[PDB]
Write an enzyme that holds these catalytic residues in place. Structure first.
Site, PDB file in Angstrom:
ATOM      1  N   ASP D  43      23.713  -5.062  32.350  1.00  0.00           N
ATOM      2  CA  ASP D  43      24.669  -4.497  31.399  1.00  0.00           C
ATOM      3  C   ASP D  43      24.008  -4.100  30.080  1.00  0.00           C
ATOM      4  OD1 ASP D  43      25.031  -6.485  29.228  1.00  0.00           O
ATOM      5  OD2 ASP D  43      25.738  -7.775  30.861  1.00  0.00           O
TER       6      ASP D  43
HETATM    7  C1  LIG Z   1      25.701 -20.802  17.244  1.00  0.00           C
HETATM    8  C2  LIG Z   1      26.854 -20.293  18.113  1.00  0.00           C
HETATM    9  C3  LIG Z   1      28.122 -19.831  17.352  1.00  0.00           C
HETATM   10  C4  LIG Z   1      28.732 -18.482  17.822  1.00  0.00           C
HETATM   11  C5  LIG Z   1      28.886 -17.390  16.726  1.00  0.00           C
HETATM   12  C6  LIG Z   1      30.187 -16.536  16.770  1.00  0.00           C
HETATM   13  C7  LIG Z   1      30.010 -15.018  17.107  1.00  0.00           C
HETATM   14  C8  LIG Z   1      31.266 -14.102  16.901  1.00  0.00           C
HETATM   15  C9  LIG Z   1      31.054 -12.551  16.971  1.00  0.00           C
HETATM   16  C10 LIG Z   1      32.323 -11.708  17.315  1.00  0.00           C
HETATM   17  C11 LIG Z   1      32.233 -10.166  17.095  1.00  0.00           C
HETATM   18  C12 LIG Z   1      32.828  -9.286  18.215  1.00  0.00           C
HETATM   19  O1  LIG Z   1      33.501  -9.754  19.087  1.00  0.00           O
HETATM   20  S1  LIG Z   1      32.501  -7.463  18.215  1.00  0.00           S
HETATM   21  C13 LIG Z   1      33.650  -6.496  19.337  1.00  0.00           C
HETATM   22  C14 LIG Z   1      33.106  -6.265  20.766  1.00  0.00           C
HETATM   23  N1  LIG Z   1      33.989  -5.453  21.619  1.00  0.00           N
HETATM   24  C15 LIG Z   1      33.789  -4.099  21.894  1.00  0.00           C
HETATM   25  O2  LIG Z   1      32.816  -3.546  21.392  1.00  0.00           O
HETATM   26  C16 LIG Z   1      34.770  -3.346  22.781  1.00  0.00           C
HETATM   27  C17 LIG Z   1      34.174  -2.430  23.873  1.00  0.00           C
HETATM   28  N2  LIG Z   1      33.396  -3.150  24.881  1.00  0.00           N
HETATM   29  C18 LIG Z   1      32.054  -2.835  25.165  1.00  0.00           C
HETATM   30  O3  LIG Z   1      31.569  -1.917  24.518  1.00  0.00           O
HETATM   31  C19 LIG Z   1      31.242  -3.611  26.240  1.00  0.00           C
HETATM   32  O4  LIG Z   1      32.224  -4.261  26.968  1.00  0.00           O
HETATM   33  C20 LIG Z   1      30.237  -4.654  25.656  1.00  0.00           C
HETATM   34  C21 LIG Z   1      30.304  -5.977  26.401  1.00  0.00           C
HETATM   35  C22 LIG Z   1      30.590  -4.858  24.196  1.00  0.00           C
HETATM   36  C23 LIG Z   1      28.725  -4.126  25.761  1.00  0.00           C
HETATM   37  O5  LIG Z   1      28.689  -2.805  25.683  1.00  0.00           O
HETATM   38  P1  LIG Z   1      27.505  -1.793  26.666  1.00  0.00           P
HETATM   39  O6  LIG Z   1      28.442  -1.177  27.675  1.00  0.00           O
HETATM   40  O7  LIG Z   1      26.992  -0.898  25.571  1.00  0.00           O
HETATM   41  O8  LIG Z   1      26.539  -2.825  27.200  1.00  0.00           O
END
Ligand SMILES: CCCCCCCCCCCC(=O)SCCNC(=O)CCNC(=O)[C@H](O)C(C)(C)COP(=O)(O)O
Ligand SMILES: CCCCCCCCCCCCCCCCCC(=O)OC[C@H](COP(=O)([O-])OCC(O)COP(=O)([O-])OC[C@@H](COC(=O)CCCCCCCCCCCCCCCCC)OC(=O)CCCCCCCCCCCCCCCCC)OC(=O)CCCCCCCCCCCCCCCCC
Ligand SMILES: CCCCCCCCCCCCCCCCCC(=O)OC[C@H](COP(=O)([O-])OCC(O)COP(=O)([O-])OC[C@@H](COC(=O)CCCCCCCCCCCCCCCCC)OC(=O)CCCCCCCCCCCCCCCCC)OC(=O)CCCCCCCCCCCCCCCCC
Ligand SMILES: CCCCCCCCCCCCCCCCC[C@@H](O)O[C@H](CO[C@H](O)CCCCCCCCCCCCCCC)COP(=O)(O)OCC[N+](C)(C)C
Ligand SMILES: CCCCCCCCCCCCCCCCC[C@@H](O)O[C@H](CO[C@H](O)CCCCCCCCCCCCCCC)COP(=O)(O)OCC[N+](C)(C)C
Ligand SMILES: CCCCCCCC/C=C\CCCCCCCC(=O)O[C@H](COC(=O)CCCCCCC/C=C/CCCCCCCC)COP(=O)(O)OCCN
Ligand SMILES: Nc1ncnc2c1ncn2[C@@H]1O[C@H](COP(=O)(O)OP(=O)(O)O)[C@@H](O)[C@H]1O
Lengths: 347, 49, 459, 88, 104, 320, 98, 54
Positions: D43
């Protein structure tokens, strides 16, 4: 830095040297060295430019180490004889420590490493002072304690200084490092004759000082610190390069120039003491100094290097501040051999 | 002529010229007098004259 | 003796106060008059030297050398004023100053009574020569040549200084009269062997001796015309004069220390003479003929006989004149075609008939045609060598055969055959060049009628 | 002296070592021309981790753009060759 | 610019005969050149070469060759009449020489 | 008594000469704008010495007699031929740019010396700080190589760091078509060959880079073509500036002493303009250097120092 | 010489050795300079007290004074170096070569 | 027909840090035109402190 502060620091450096030169008590000689170093450090840092800070730190560490060994030798001598007067140094371990401390202060090999770095890191005026005035106090001390000096150690360091200065100068394009290696070689020549005749040491010091002053003033007049920067001077002031070529030939030791007088006078002295191999090796080794002087003369005066267009603008302006003692220094560094017998006035 | 009037020009600095010439003649006069005194003293000490 | 030195010193302010277009005239006239004054030193005694003062003296060995030295300056000025035309006024005066300083140093060198003063002047002659070579030479090799000239000489003479101040510490003086009268034999010891080497190797490098002659084909080739003229005519003879002067202290050590140098000279004569046969550079051929000729002077000085010393003096003078003339003759062609390759310009006798006559006479004197003084000196040295050992006649004979071969070859390549078709800028000879050749050749021939004037103190 | 004259073969060896060091890729299966998304079923997020591993391996910053196209090992080799000026 | 600098072209040599067909090869200026020729010829061929050669030819006999010939004639005459040997094997008299004590 | 350490020890300081009217002012803007007339009027209203824009023969005007020298002995570059052939293979473009930067450096040193010695303010047209906008436009149009830009940056780095930037930066903003029409109206046949892309690049350099980093050390006064002719408004706009952003209030008598010791002695000012970086456009061979230098020395007042030339009417030479 | 004199001399030798063999921090070397001064002070005081040289009793005090000037000098330099690098490591002083 | 004088290719031999370049020494660079090195903008960290809640 304020001009008054600069003036008083220069007077303090000179006062420390004179305190070393007029003292009969070892503690006052040590104090003179300390006072000289204290005022010497800010003169090396007059222009900040971190290379100057590096040079000042290296110089301070070297000179402080030398001062500590000097004090330890003084104390050992006092322990083995309740004497403070500067004399023939009743203890031989103290004498070895004192000779090593003074060799570190002068920069004789193998304590020679700091001279090229400090000279390259400071300005040309600071380099002039460092390579001329700073040698007076240690050599004046060595003249006084020369009778108790071990010839094998002093002559070993003298030969090493001549060899190392000659070899190091061959690899240099920067003018200040060339001057430093020349200084190391001339220090070796000065200290080779010291156990035999201090008048020859004084004569060599005076001739080396006038030659070094002429060379440094000619490099200040044409603001050149590299070989390629000096190669532009023929197209702006040909007379300066001509006088530089003659001074370089004299520094080489070629007769009938002034540079020849000390070597001629040292070799002769060493032959009266049944030393033949040593002067022959020293004279043959000085040819390395002559080679890297001749290479600079080729670069600056005997051929014409390409110039730049903006040099044309410099044709319209004159050197504003004049050095009054430069002509006398040039004449003294070149045309003085016929008055060699006047050296008897130095004893 | 010149653009900037070039202050040191056709009328030379007469004070400096006078000082230079006075120093030269003073040195020469002193040297001749000194040599005369040296010769007289040398002859006086050696019983020559 | 100051009646020659002081007029020579006055050539400097006269040159510097001359008009921009009068320096050559003034310098030539007054150097010729100095030569006229120098001719008075040829009046020599049969028993001792002309002891002018505590500092300067003249002998039957140094008087002809002085006359040749003073005579060479006008010829150098005549030969230099053509290729220095486009030069600025101050640089022309600097070149003439270099020549005047060289003459002054040589004149004092040949007449110094004390060996340390002789050494100082003999070393001072290096500075003007090096400046001339490395400032007014034409090619990029002139720098390297200068270094070769500087360090070959000094590496030889630095021990000599150490020897000289050593000798004064044991005998008390370096005055040559005292040295000669109070002479003592040299013992057979390692210390004396190295003192002998220190007194000899400096002069051997100047000759030069085969093996340490590398600096010469560089320095003479890359130098300007006056530089090569003075290098061949006078500067090579400094070694011969110094060896002749210093040999007195050397005996009886010289009998066995001379063998390696005699072998090197008697074989390098053949070596350099044969090298001349395969030489694409004309000026380089002329330079190598000098090494071949000075090997003979080395042999004559080493074998230490009156006939050998007479022959060596005569050969030194004759070689000075002939080699200077040959260098000038090559320069005449170089200033036309701007190449020193011998086969580039051929058949020149057709285009330059009188310069061909000059070439022929110079080649004839180079191969020692009798009764030229070249032949007188050569034959005296050969007779003395035959006395030293008969087998020498084989080596000596071989050298004579080879010398004639490369001389006439040099003549046939440049003058005979057919002229190359493309060259079309070969102008007729100038009066300056013809007079320069005549002033070389006429004194040479005139010296045949009075050879005792050039035969040294052993006549 | 400084770093040796790196060649294409070294770049390929290092890149393939990095890929075979990735857990989500079976080693002997991957090739030099295998597309990351199609061949290995990787992916978009996985590709980002691989590019960051390249930045750690070769020590230079690969922007987000010009990393969206390095989709098989060979393109990575070409990109590093272009950035470091290596031809043979 | 595929040139490394701004430089003058190499200029072609000047023929002195173009402007002075009787040029003597001493100088570009005809008058100065002619006087250079005259002065070289007069002071080299007329003064040093002829007068110097004449001066050297008539130098007085300071080498004492005629004197030595006269002295040799005198002693040969004296010795022959006397019956004494013409030349003596020892230059220095034996009476004034003090050899070491004995041959062993 | 020429100014120096001894004059500083006995009294003289430069902080006492400043009277709030010092105000080094530079009036920038593109080609054929009205900045020259604005600068002259500003200098007239404020009683400040004006400096016309430093050209090829600027250095000639300050030495000897103010008459310009031959292009061979001074400049060795042509603006007219830069307009005729910007991509000439004889290096005229970068040679002109580098010579002009040197002339601007000399003019800035002269202006600073005048201000620090008399206390009277100076008005300049351009300066070393805005010179680069002509360099970038040269490079973007493909008139100079990248090595020329690197050499220019090297020379600027070791030179512009030794001076105080101007108090007031006045910019005259005139759009490209208007200056184009003005150029076509002026009548100069060479100047009409300026492309619109060249002027657009000059404006882009002025607005994107020059003004932003000029505005972070002192306030910048931008004006349009019509309101630039109204000089009294600009002068009173300058009269009510609050200069608290630059290093000028952060200057002591010792820093002013160092700066004044530098601004005299023009040889030290021009020290790093001729660094031994051998680019073909500016490197001159040894033969041409020797010929041109000898030609320069033969000029009527140049063979000796200014007071020692018998052939321009100097007298009593033997007693100086 | 008693054992105390050799202990003082050994202290000086250890400090000199410490000064000569650099680690990383510049301040570590300034401390060895101070230690060399302290060893000299103790040695000269012991010699002076033992021989009852009354006038010499002022020289260690003088010796102390120029010890401070040397320390204050060194610390001053240590400031500038640090201001250039944010670290007093002697590795950073490599702009100038031999 | 002209005396040979050095050109750029000749002059560049002396422009190096050392006269004889060596594998290790070829990476040495000449000093800056003024003796002023680029300012080492070392990140002197500011201490971070929690003032409160307690
Ligand atoms: C130490 C541990 C603590 C954890 C830290 C907490 C982190 C929180 C961060 C939260 C920010 C978000 O969710 S950011 C929002 C993310 N969602 C989107 O972008 C919607 C569209 N989906 C997609 O583009 C694909 O499904 C994708 C899988 C993204 C890959 O893309 P590719 O097709 O280009 O591989
Ligand atoms: C065997 C016999 C032979 C023996 C031989 C002896 C050795 C011979 C010489 C050895 C080598 C000498 C080398 C000298 C190096 C000097 C370095 C240097 O100055 O830079 C070069 C300098 C560079 O100039 P530049 O870069 O163009 O100028 C820019 C400025 O630097 C830009 O700087 P600025 O803007 O700051 O400008 C300030 C400027 C302008 O100046 C001013 O404005 C003046 C201001 C006045 C301020 C007053 C302050 C007073 C308060 C301070 C008090 C201090 C007290 C200290 C004492 C404490 C005691 C406990 O001041 C200076 O430039 C320097 C001032 C120099 C002051 C000299 C002080 C002398 C002290 C004497 C000490 C001894 C006293 C007795 C001690 C007894 C024991 C205790 O030019 C030269 O100096 C050329 C070389 C000159 C050498 C001279 C030749 C040798 C001597 C020949 C004369 C005869 C000598 C023999 C005499 C015999 C006895 C009678
Ligand atoms: C034994 C002879 C008797 C002579 C009587 C007196 C003659 C005095 C002349 C003195 C020499 C003059 C200086 C030489 C440069 C000439 C200047 C010139 O360019 O003239 C052009 C002039 C005008 O012609 P042109 O049509 O313009 O020419 C166009 C081309 O250049 C075309 O020109 P070219 O193809 O006609 O070439 C010129 C011509 C002539 O050019 C030369 O070769 C002149 C140089 C001769 C060779 C010298 C170098 C070789 C080493 C030996 C040196 C010996 C020196 C003797 C003392 C000389 C004192 C000055 O070439 C030759 O004829 C072949 C030369 C090879 C000679 C072979 C014989 C050598 C041994 C002879 C015996 C020597 C000792 C004699 C006493 C023995 C016991 C009694 O021609 C003449 O006036 C004739 C030239 C003179 C020829 C004399 C040949 C014999 C010389 C013997 C030596 C002197 C002895 C004097 C005492 C009595 C014996
Ligand atoms: C290419 C141009 C270079 C210049 C040429 C210069 C030539 C220099 C040669 C010097 C000539 C002779 C030197 C010393 C004389 C004899 C040397 C030795 O071979 O002979 C034997 C010497 O004995 C042994 O062989 C010792 C010498 C062996 C060690 C020296 C090494 C020589 C090898 C050649 C080196 C190359 C020379 C040039 C260097 C660049 C003699 O037997 P011996 O009875 O016992 O000694 C008597 C001598 N005394 C009286 C002083 C005691
Ligand atoms: C162009 C056409 C060519 C052919 C036509 C020419 C016509 C013929 C002319 C040639 C003449 C032929 C010569 C015949 C020999 C006669 C001359 C001879 O008698 O003179 C000699 C005399 O010659 C001189 O001695 C030699 C002159 C010395 C040469 C010095 C050159 C001038 C200085 C130039 C400087 C060069 C440097 C030299 C370095 C040493 C004899 O010497 P000497 O036996 O005693 O005299 C006995 C009587 N004395 C003693 C009373 C005088
Ligand atoms: C262009 C190349 C030319 C090379 C020339 C170099 C060779 C010169 C010859 C040797 C030079 C040094 C000789 C020293 C001067 C002699 C003075 C003297 O007599 O001293 C000797 C001492 O002699 C020496 O010490 C010389 C030994 C050698 C020292 C330096 C070695 C140089 C190399 C030696 C071999 C090379 C020489 C031949 C090479 C020819 C050129 C290739 C004896 O004195 P005392 O000690 O008092 O003895 C009596 C009471 N005990
Ligand atoms: N630094 C520079 N670089 C290149 N060309 C310049 C430079 N300065 C001025 N010029 C040119 O000089 C001419 C006049 O300059 P400009 O300021 O545009 O008009 P003016 O100053 O006469 O009002 C114009 O052709 C301009 O392009």
């Amino acid at each position: 830095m304020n001009p008054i502060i600069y003036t008083t620091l220069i007077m303090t450096v000179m006062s420390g040297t004179m305190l070393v030169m007029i003292s009969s008590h070892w503690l006052l000689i040590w104090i003179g060295f300390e006072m000289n170093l204290l005022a010497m450090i800010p003169v090396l840092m007059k222009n900040f430019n971190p290379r100057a800070t590096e040079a000042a730190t290296k110089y301070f560490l070297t000179q402080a180490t030398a001062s500590m060994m000097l004090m330890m030798a003084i104390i050992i001598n006092l322990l083995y004889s309740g004497q403070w007067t500067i004399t023939k140094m009743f203890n031989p371990v103290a004498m070895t420590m004192m000779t090593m401390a003074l060799a570190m202060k002068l920069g004789l090999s193998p304590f020679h490493f700091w001279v090229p770095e400090v000279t390259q890191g400071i300005s040309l005026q600071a380099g002039l002072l460092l390579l001329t005035w700073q040698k007076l106090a240690p050599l004046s001390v060595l003249c006084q304690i020369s009778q108790s000096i071990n010839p094998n150690l002093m002559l070993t360091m003298a030969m090493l200084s001549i060899l190392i200065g000659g070899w190091g100068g061959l690899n240099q394009t920067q003018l200040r490092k060339i001057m430093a290696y020349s200084s190391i070689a001339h220090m070796g020549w000065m200290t080779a004759v010291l156990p035999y005749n201090t008048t020859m040491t004084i004569l060599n010091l005076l001739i080396y000082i006038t030659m070094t002053l002429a060379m440094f003033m000619l490099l200040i007049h044409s603001s050149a610190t590299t070989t390629l920067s000096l190669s532009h001077t023929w197209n702006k002031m040909p007379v300066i390069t001509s006088l530089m070529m003659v001074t370089l030939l004299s520094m080489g030791g070629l007769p009938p120039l002034s540079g020849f007088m000390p070597k001629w006078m040292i070799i002769q002295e060493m032959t009266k003491n049944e030393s033949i191999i040593m002067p022959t090796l020293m004279a043959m080794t000085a040819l390395l100094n002559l080679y890297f002087y001749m290479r600079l003369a080729y670069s600056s005066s005997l051929t014409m290097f390409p110039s730049t267009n903006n040099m044309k603008m410099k044709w319209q302006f004159e050197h504003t501040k004049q050095m009054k003692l430069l002509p006398t220094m040039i004449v003294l560094s070149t045309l003085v051999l016929p008055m060699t017998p006047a050296l008897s006035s130095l004893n | 002529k010149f653009y900037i009037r070039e202050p040191p020009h056709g009328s030379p600095d007469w004070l400096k010229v006078g000082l230079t010439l006075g120093t030269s003649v003073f040195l020469w006069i002193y040297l001749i007098k000194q040599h005369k005194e040296d010769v007289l003293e040398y002859k006086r000490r050696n019983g020559l004259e | 003796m100051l009646k020659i030195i002081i007029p020579t010193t006055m050539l400097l302010p006269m040159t510097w106060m001359s008009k921009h277009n009068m320096i050559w005239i003034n310098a030539t006239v007054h150097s010729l008059l100095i030569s006229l004054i120098s001719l008075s030193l040829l009046n020599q005694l049969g028993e001792n030297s002309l002891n002018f003062s505590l500092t300067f003296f003249s002998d039957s060995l140094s008087a002809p050398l002085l006359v040749l030295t003073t005579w060479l300056l006008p010829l150098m000025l005549m030969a230099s004023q053509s290729h220095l035309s486009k030069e600025t006024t101050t640089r022309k005066k600097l070149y003439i100053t270099m020549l005047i300083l060289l003459q002054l140093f040589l004149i004092m060198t040949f007449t110094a009574t004390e060996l340390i003063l002789f050494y100082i002047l003999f070393e001072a002659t290096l500075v003007p020569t090096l400046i001339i070579i490395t400032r007014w030479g034409n090619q990029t090799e002139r720098l390297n040549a200068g270094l070769y000239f500087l360090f070959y000489t000094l590496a030889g003479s630095l021990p000599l200084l150490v020897a000289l101040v050593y000798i004064q510490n044991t005998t008390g003086s370096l005055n040559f009269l005292i040295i000669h009268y109070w002479s003592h034999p040299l013992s057979n010891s390692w210390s004396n062997i190295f003192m002998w080497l220190a007194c000899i190797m400096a002069f051997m490098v100047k000759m030069p001796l085969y093996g340490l002659h590398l600096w010469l084909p560089k320095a003479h080739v890359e130098a300007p015309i006056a530089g090569s003229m003075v290098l061949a005519a006078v500067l090579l003879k400094l070694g011969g004069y110094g060896m002749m002067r210093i040999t007195t202290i050397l005996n009886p050590l010289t009998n066995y220390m001379a063998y390696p140098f005699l072998m090197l000279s008697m074989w390098g004569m053949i070596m350099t003479s044969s090298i001349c046969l395969r030489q694409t550079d004309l000026k380089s051929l002329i330079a190598y003929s000098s090494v071949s000729h000075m090997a003979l002077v080395i042999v004559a000085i080493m074998i230490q006989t009156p006939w050998s010393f007479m022959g060596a003096t005569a050969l030194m003078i004759a070689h000075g004149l002939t080699s200077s003339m040959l260098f000038c003759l090559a320069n005449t062609n170089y200033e036309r075609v701007h190449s020193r390759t011998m086969i580039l310009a051929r058949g020149l006798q057709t285009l330059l008939p009188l310069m061909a006559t000059w070439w022929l006479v110079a080649s004839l004197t180079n191969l020692a045609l009798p009764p030229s003084i070249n032949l007188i000196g050569e034959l005296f040295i050969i007779t003395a060598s035959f006395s030293w050992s008969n087998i020498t006649i084989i080596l000596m004979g071989m050298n004579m055969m080879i010398t004639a071969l490369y001389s006439l070859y040099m003549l046939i390549t440049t003058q005979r055959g057919k002229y190359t078709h493309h060259i079309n800028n070969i102008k007729p000879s100038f009066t300056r060049e013809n007079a320069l050749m005549a002033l070389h050749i006429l004194p040479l021939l005139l010296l045949t009628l009075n050879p005792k004037m050039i035969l040294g103190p052993l006549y | 002296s400084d770093a040796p004259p790196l060649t294409l073969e070294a770049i390929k060896d290092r890149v393939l070592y990095v890929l075979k060091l990735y857990d989500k890729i079976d080693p002997e299966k991957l090739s030099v021309n295998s597309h990351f998304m199609k061949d290995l079923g990787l992916d978009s997020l996985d590709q980002v981790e691989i590019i960051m591993a390249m930045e750690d391996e070769f020590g230079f910053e690969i922007p987000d753009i010009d990393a969206e196209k390095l989709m098989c090992p060979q393109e990575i080799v070409d990109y590093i060759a272009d950035k470091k000026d290596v031809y043979e | 610019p595929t040139i490394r600098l701004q430089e003058d072209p190499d200029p072609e040599d000047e023929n002195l005969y173009e402007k002075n067909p009787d040029s003597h090869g001493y100088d570009k200026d005809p008058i100065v050149d002619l006087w250079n020729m005259r002065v070289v010829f007069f002071f080299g061929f007329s003064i040093v070469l002829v007068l110097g050669s004449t001066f050297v030819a008539y130098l007085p006999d300071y080498r004492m060759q005629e004197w030595a010939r006269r002295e040799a004639e005198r002693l040969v005459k004296y010795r022959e009449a006397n019956g004494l040997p013409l030349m003596e094997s020892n230059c220095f008299d034996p009476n004034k020489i003090q050899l070491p004590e004995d041959e062993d | 008594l020429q100014y120096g350490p001894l004059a500083f020890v006995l009294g003289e300081r430069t902080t006492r000469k400043l009277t709030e009217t010092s105000k080094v002012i530079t009036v920038d803007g593109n080609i054929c704008s009205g900045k020259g007339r604005l600068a002259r009027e500003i200098a007239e209203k404020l009683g400040l010495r004006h400096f016309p824009e430093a050209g090829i023969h600027y250095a000639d005007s300050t030495t000897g007699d103010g008459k310009p020298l031959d292009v061979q002995l001074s400049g060795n570059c042509s603006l007219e031929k830069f307009y005729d052939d910007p991509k000439s293979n004889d290096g005229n473009s970068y040679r002109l740019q580098s010579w002009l930067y040197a002339s601007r450096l000399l003019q800035y040193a002269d202006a600073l010396e005048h201000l620090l010695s008399t206390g009277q303010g100076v008005v300049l047209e351009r300066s070393i700080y805005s010179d680069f906008v002509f360099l970038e436009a040269m490079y973007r149009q493909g008139f100079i190589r990248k090595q020329c830009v690197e050499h220019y940056n090297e020379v600027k780095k070791v030179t512009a760091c030794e001076y105080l930037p101007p108090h007031v930066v006045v910019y005259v903003d005139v759009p490209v078509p208007e200056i184009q029409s003005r150029i076509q109206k002026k009548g100069n046949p060479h100047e009409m060959k300026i492309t619109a892309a060249y002027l657009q690049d000059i404006e882009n350099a002025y607005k994107k880079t020059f003004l932003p980093e000029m505005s972070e050390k002192c306030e910048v006064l931008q004006y349009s073509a019509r309101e630039a002719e109204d000089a009294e408004k600009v002068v009173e706009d300058i009269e009510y500036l609050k200069c608290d952003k630059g290093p000028w209030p952060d200057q002591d008598d010792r820093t002013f002493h160092r700066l004044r010791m530098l601004v005299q002695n023009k040889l030290e000012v021009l020290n790093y303009t001729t660094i031994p970086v051998y680019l073909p456009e500016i490197t001159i061979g040894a033969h041409q250097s020797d010929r041109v230098f000898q030609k320069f020395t033969e000029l009527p007042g140049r063979k000796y120092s200014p007071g020692y030339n018998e052939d321009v009417g100097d007298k009593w030479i033997w007693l100086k | 010489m008693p054992l105390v004199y050799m202990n003082i001399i050994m202290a000086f030798a250890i400090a000199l050795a410490g000064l000569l063999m650099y680690r990383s921090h510049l301040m570590s070397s300034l401390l060895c300079l101070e230690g060399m001064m302290l060893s000299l002070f103790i040695m000269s005081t012991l010699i002076i007290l033992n021989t009852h040289f009354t006038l010499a009793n002022m020289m260690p005090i003088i010796l102390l004074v120029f010890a401070a000037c040397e320390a204050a000098l060194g610390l001053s330099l240590l400031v500038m170096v640090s201001n250039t690098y944010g670290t007093d490591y002697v590795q950073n002083l490599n702009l100038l070569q031999c | 027909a002209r005396q040979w004088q050095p050109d750029v290719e000749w002059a560049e031999q002396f422009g190096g840090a050392v006269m004889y370049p060596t594998k290790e020494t070829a990476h040495w660079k000449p000093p800056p035109w003024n003796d002023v090195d680029p300012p080492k903008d070392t990140l002197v960290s500011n201490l971070t402190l929690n003032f409160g809640p307690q």
